[PDB]
Structure formats: structure tokens, C-alpha cells
Design a protein around this nucleic acid. Structure first.
Ligand code: ZN
Ligand code: ZN
Ligand code: ZN
Length: 131
DNA sequence: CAAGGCACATGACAACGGTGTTCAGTGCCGCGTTGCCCGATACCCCCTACCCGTAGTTGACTGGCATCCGGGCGCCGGGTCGCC
């Protein structure tokens, strides 16, 4: 996980933590689990590295209803949409050219120069209903 | 003269006003700590220059050295050969 800044142990540690975690997480709870591992990193520094990862683009970023920004990394480079369960957090990556063509067609119809789509589908889990 | 009819105001009724606080999220500036990058420095190599130890050099050449006295002074102590 290369970063724009000079490599060191702490960015490697947070990158490895993101690698192990395959769920949507917030910065504060990410720091909580990171401290639980025992690295004892700083809050604001963790912010810098996660922000850098979001800027780099190798980690997707989502915004919750509460307004918190949450992050998680994706195995595949190409763009995709993550279906996520609020209770579980199971993020599954899917993509469809139909929505892309729809966006381009709308942009052309309205004479828009450039666009950027943000589509996230929320829903109820299959196993959450079961008990 | 008493009972029945209409005005204004009234006991509550929430919801705005405006402003103060709550978790929480994320930075914004202050203090301190970190990967680089090089640059010099200790430490292997090769070469030869020079110090230092060993071994020969065949006419003949076969025993030295200069001592030492003007203490001075007395005693100890032992050796040392005569003595009868
Ligand atoms: Zn993604
Ligand atoms: Zn998309
Ligand atoms: Zn679920």
C-alpha cells in the first residue's frame, strides 16, 4: 500500500488493518480497534492517512445518514457499487454498464460537459430477519 | 321580572425563537518525532621496499690486563704457623 508520504511503520499498520477489515468503518472506531491491537497511534495522524487513502482512491468512501464518513478498501480496481447492510456491514461490489450508459445519455441530453455519479443502494439483510 | 340569547377573554392547548449545549467528527494550528538521501570512514584486498636474522669467508697468524702504596683507625674475628 504505497502512500504519497514517506513510508513508515504506522501507515503500514493502518493499511494492514484496512486489509484485514472488509467492512465499512468510521475513523473513530477504526482508531478504537487500532488501539485495541496495541499500536497506540494518534487520532489526527490516522485522519491524515485515511484521507490520503481516500484521495488516492484505493479505498472507497461512503457517507452515512448521520453524516459520518466511512471507508473500506476494494479488491478490484474498476469502479463498482457496494450493497451494504446497516446491521451487518457486508459490503459486496457490483457494477453495471446500464447505469453508466444512462448517466452518459442524461448528460448528453442536458448538454452537460462532465459528470460524476454517486449511487448507493441500502436494504435489509437476508439473515437479519431470521432469528 | 326571570330566562334565553350574543360579545371578548380565558384555562388549557403546541409550536415557534433564539440561544445554549451534546457526541462526534474532523481538522487547524501549535509542539515534537520519522522514513529517506547521501558522505565519509573503517577495513578487506593486491604490489614492492626495506629491516633483520643466519651462514659463509681458508698463505700463515697459539697467553693479557694494568694494577697497587701518603685513608686512618680501630676493632673483631678467625686463621696460622711457631712453641715447647
Ligand atoms: Zn469500492
Ligand atoms: Zn457506478
Ligand atoms: Zn445484515
Amino acid at each position: 500500500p504505497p502512500v504519497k508520504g514517506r513510508a513508515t511503520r504506522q501507515r503500514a499498520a493502518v493499511s494492514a488493518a484496512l486489509q484485514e477489515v472488509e467492512e465499512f468503518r468510521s475513523a473513530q472506531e477504526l482508531h478504537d480497534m487500532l488501539k485495541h491491537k496495541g499500536d497506540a497511534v494518534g487520532l489526527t495522524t490516522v485522519y491524515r492517512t485515511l484521507q490520503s487513502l481516500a484521495d488516492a482512491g484505493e479505498v472507497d468512501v461512503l457517507r452515512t445518514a448521520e453524516g459520518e464518513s466511512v471507508y473500506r478498501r476494494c479488491s478490484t480496481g474498476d469502479h463498482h457499487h457496494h450493497l451494504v447492510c446497516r446491521a451487518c456491514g457486508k459490503a459486496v461490489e457490483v457494477e453495471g454498464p446500464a447505469v453508466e450508459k444512462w448517466a452518459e445519455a442524461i448528460a448528453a441530453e442536458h448538454g452537460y460537459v462532465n459528470v460524476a455519479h454517486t449511487v448507493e443502494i441500502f436494504g435489509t439483510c437476508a439473515d437479519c430477519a431470521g432469528a
